[PDB]
Amino acid sequence: KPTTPGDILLYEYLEPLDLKINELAELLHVHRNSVSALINNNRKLTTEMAFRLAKVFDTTVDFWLNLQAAVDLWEVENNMRTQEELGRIETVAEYLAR
Amino acid sequence: KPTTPGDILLYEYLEPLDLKINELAELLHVHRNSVSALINNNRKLTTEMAFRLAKVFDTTVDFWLNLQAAVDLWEVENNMRTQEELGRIETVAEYLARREER
């Protein structure tokens, strides 16, 4: 699995800065449970939470959203059931014609 | 206010090619109600749906995801509770400075 926003948050900010999850939650103005879920990759990053992270850490909102975007695509590429389905989808071309 | 993926789908694909909701549904292989919810913005365009649309209309997945991204950004920017809140957030640079004083 690609690097999640949670991975980046824990390994490149929290640990290097000696910052606790509860301190971050306070800085972000969200419940501790929301930060932990993000870090354990249990909840996808929302646009709103991306803005909060951008604020606290002084980055663009894009930076956080792109990490989530790459993970999202990875999840669909690796779901074989979904891939098989995309396999028999007929395009608007073959259709409009026939 | 950006054009939702639903509007692009309806006004730039379904109507110029006279393709029905039900017709697109059977192509995407999803229930008619999912397509209708996408078009009316009651359901966000998901990553999987983006893959299906990409396949049916021969586009990239991001062509669709970028449209939903624009809507997501608009929603946050026009939510006053969130904006005031974002305005009150203390940065980590500030916080760490304060913490070291204690």
Swiss-Prot record, chain A:
InterPro entries named among the record's database cross-references: Cro/C1-type_HTH, Lambda_DNA-bd_dom_sf, Toxin_antidote_HigA
DNA-binding region boundaries: 21-40
Pfam family, one: HTH_3
GO molecular function: DNA binding
CDD domains on file: HTH_XRE
Entries under SUPFAM superfamilies matching the protein: lambda repressor-like DNA-binding domains
Keywords noted in UniProt: DNA-binding, Transcription, Transcription regulation
SMART domains: HTH_XRE (SM00530)
Domain HTH cro/C1-type: 10-64
Annotated family: Belongs to the VapA/VapI family.
Annotated protein name in UniProt: Uncharacterized HTH-type transcriptional regulator YbaQ
From Swiss-Prot, chain B:
SUPFAM superfamilies assigned to the protein according to its UniProt record, in alphabetical order: lambda repressor-like DNA-binding domains
Keywords, sorted A to Z: DNA-binding, Transcription, Transcription regulation
Native organism: Escherichia coli (strain K12)
Protein name in the entry: Uncharacterized HTH-type transcriptional regulator YbaQ
The keyword Cell cycle is assigned to this record: no
Similarity annotation: Belongs to the VapA/VapI family.
DNA-binding region: 21-40
Location of the HTH cro/C1-type domain: 10-64
Name of one Pfam family that matches: HTH_3
Stored InterPro entries: Cro/C1-type_HTH (IPR001387), Lambda_DNA-bd_dom_sf (IPR010982), Toxin_antidote_HigA (IPR013430)
UniProt GO MF annotations: DNA binding
GN (gene name): ybaQ
